[PDB]
Amino acid sequence: KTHVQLSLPVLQVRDVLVRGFGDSVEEVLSEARQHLKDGTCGLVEVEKGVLPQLEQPYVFIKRSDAAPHGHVMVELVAELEGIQYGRSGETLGVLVPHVGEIPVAYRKVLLRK
């Protein structure tokens, strides 16, 4: 399937134990896609002071369309030193590994895979 329905645990930035997916744009996009497939991916909602508490490169989920079965269609865009790899809509948040942190909410997304 080109798209997969996922329910992503929303994590508080200060709870996150593993603050990024790796060391290159290509690795973080690779690792994010693997964690999304394996159900081991969390979502941090971006506000003032969040991103500097996480590790670059960042992986964003961005709205790709204007929401089947409640699931917002999203795609992945990476960012390193202010350059983004991908073009898409509004940021829904930054992806991080999920290793058992208690979420505050769930974000239903349809991921272009």
Q: What is the resolution of this structure in A?
A: 1.8
Which residue segments constitute the domains of the chain, with CATH numbers given?
Answer: 3-112 (2.30.30)
How was this structure obtained?
A: X-ray
CA angle 55/9/83 to nearest 5° reads 30
Q: Are strands 72-80 and 58-63 parallel, antiparallel or unpaired?
A: antiparallel
